[PDB]
Amino acid sequence: GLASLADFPIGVAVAASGGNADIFTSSARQNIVRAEFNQITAENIMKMSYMYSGSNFSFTNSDRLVSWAAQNGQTVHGHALVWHPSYQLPNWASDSNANFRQDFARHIDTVAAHFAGQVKSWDVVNEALFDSADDPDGRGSANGYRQSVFYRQFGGPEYIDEAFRRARAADPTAELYYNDFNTEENGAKTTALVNLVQRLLNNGVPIDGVGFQMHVMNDYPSIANIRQAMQKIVALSPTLKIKITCLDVRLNNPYDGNSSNDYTNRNDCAVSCAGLDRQKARYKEIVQAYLEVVPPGRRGGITVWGIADPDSWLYTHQNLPDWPLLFNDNLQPKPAYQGVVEALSG
């Protein structure tokens, strides 16, 4: 499979919350994972609040998943130690909690140590950079940073240095990553990413790599921009690893101001359509760019955000249908799969 063509991790995100995509329930899914990948990231059950039952830590479900990975030839990328969305915020993560810094420290110390020798790498901090298109806190940019509880409670971006230092100490073997989305656009956010990373280096913070989520569209951003944005980070240090963490490719772009080029029916690209062919080229050009811009030895891996199209968080987005992954509705490989195979080979 895919994993056999590369010398760095080729992973996929797995559902584990009941439903058709549940990894423990779908043997067809388990067979794809076993045949094509060598690493898995929990799509949801490893987020912050899932580590607790009320105010006590509860690792039962995540342990079941980590254990399944190990028995099925997969390493595990942890997503994520720190992240802002209220739906997954532990109950202590509040502006009213006077013990915030202590509870924050306990969180990192405990879960990083708990999984110490079973998790290969971690999204230590995820989505700390401000983003004009996703500011639920409503506070605006604080010098490029998103003003989440963590930023507020610590009075600045130092919560980031702390998370990394904390994680490194609890698990000296895990690769520590900063992860985020839109930083491949090569725009404002890319610039902020560069400053954030530079700051961390200057401070001697133990960061091992930078993850690019890569939630792109068939035609945006251009690979020329994706290339550069990756280049800029690669250039900041001689050892920093680059990891594509949540790759997926939408055939529909609802921000282009052209509604005439949108597939609005589930049947449009169920079998064959121009977008599916462009998606083969799109996946290909991206992996190629990764291979050419990131030096061997600095390759953290490429992870696709899901197994089959219907499992995708983008199966439907902006009220439009989409077919974002490598495997279709029937668990058959799509042209996107071939694009990956060709890029990884020759």
Ligand X SMILES: O[C@@H]1[C@@H](O)[C@H](O[C@@H]2CO[C@@H](O[C@@H]3CO[C@@H](O[C@@H]4CO[C@@H](O[C@@H]5CO[C@@H](O)[C@H](O)[C@H]5O)[C@H](O)[C@H]4O)[C@H](O)[C@H]3O)[C@H](O)[C@H]2O)OC[C@H]1O
* Site residues, ligand X (CB under 6 A): 43, 133-134, 181-182, 213, 215, 220, 253, 255-256, 313
* Cβ–Cβ < 8 Å for 298, 240: yes
Q: Report the partner that residue 52 touches, choosing among Ca ion, ligand X, none (CB closer than 5 to 8 A by kind).
A: none
Interface residues with Ca ion (CB under 5 A) are 256, 258, 261-262
What is the spatial distance between Cα 132 and Cα 141, in angstroms, rounded to a whole number? 8
Closest separation between CB of residue 251 and Ca ion, Å?
10
Going along the chain, which residue ranges are E strands?
10-14, 39-42, 52-53, 56-57, 75-83, 121-126, 175-180, 209-212, 215-217, 241-250, 299-304, 316-317, 320-321
Handedness of CA 75, 47, 301, 246 (dihedral sign): positive
What is the spatial distance between Cα 261 and Cα 268, in angstroms, rounded to a whole number? 12
Q: Report the partner that residue 255 touches, choosing among Ca ion, ligand X, none (CB closer than 5 to 8 A by kind).
A: ligand X
Distances (CA, A) of 41 to 76, 245, 246: 6, 9, 9
User: Phi and psi (nearest 5°) for 28?
Assistant: -60, -35
Closest separation between CB of residue 94 and ligand X, Å?
21
**Closer CB to Ca ion, 164 or 263, in the complex:** 263
- Which among 4, 11, 68, 80 has a CA at the least distance from the CA of 40? 11
Query: Quick one: 13 exposed, middle or buried, by C-beta within 10 A (0-12, 13-18, 19+)?
Result: buried
Q: Would you list the DSSP string of 136-201?
A: TT----BTTB---HHHHHHTSTHHHHHHHHHHHHH-TTSEEEEEESSTTS-SHHHHHHHHHHHHHH
What is the spatial distance between Cα 209 and Cα 143, in angstroms, rounded to a whole number? 22
**Closer CB to ligand X, 3 or 46, in the complex:** 46
Q: Report the partner that residue 134 touches, choosing among Ca ion, ligand X, none (CB closer than 5 to 8 A by kind).
A: ligand X
**Closer CB to Ca ion, 132 or 261, in the complex:** 261
Residue nearest to ligand X (CB): 256
Closest separation between CB of residue 323 and Ca ion, Å?
15
Q: Which residue has the tokens 């439903």?
A: 19
Closest separation between CB of residue 127 and ligand X, Å?
6
Q: Report the partner that residue 181 touches, choosing among Ca ion, ligand X, none (CB closer than 5 to 8 A by kind).
A: ligand X
Q: What is the largest CA-CA distance in the chain?
A: 57
Q: Report the partner that residue 215 touches, choosing among Ca ion, ligand X, none (CB closer than 5 to 8 A by kind).
A: ligand X
- Helix or strand run (H / E) with residue 341: helix 335-344
**Closer CB to ligand X, 17 or 330, in the complex:** 17
**Closer CB to ligand X, 79 or 334, in the complex:** 79
Closest separation between CB of residue 145 and ligand X, Å?
17
**Closer CB to ligand X, 165 or 278, in the complex:** 278
Closest separation between CB of residue 336 and Ca ion, Å?
20
Closest separation between CB of residue 31 and ligand X, Å?
23
**Closer CB to ligand X, 5 or 224, in the complex:** 224
Q: Report the partner that residue 147 touches, choosing among Ca ion, ligand X, none (CB closer than 5 to 8 A by kind).
A: none
Q: Report the partner that residue 57 touches, choosing among Ca ion, ligand X, none (CB closer than 5 to 8 A by kind).
A: none
**Closer CB to ligand X, 245 or 328, in the complex:** 245
Closest separation between CB of residue 314 and Ca ion, Å?
15
Q: Report the partner that residue 262 touches, choosing among Ca ion, ligand X, none (CB closer than 5 to 8 A by kind).
A: Ca ion
What are the structure tokens assigned to 58, written together? 């509860």
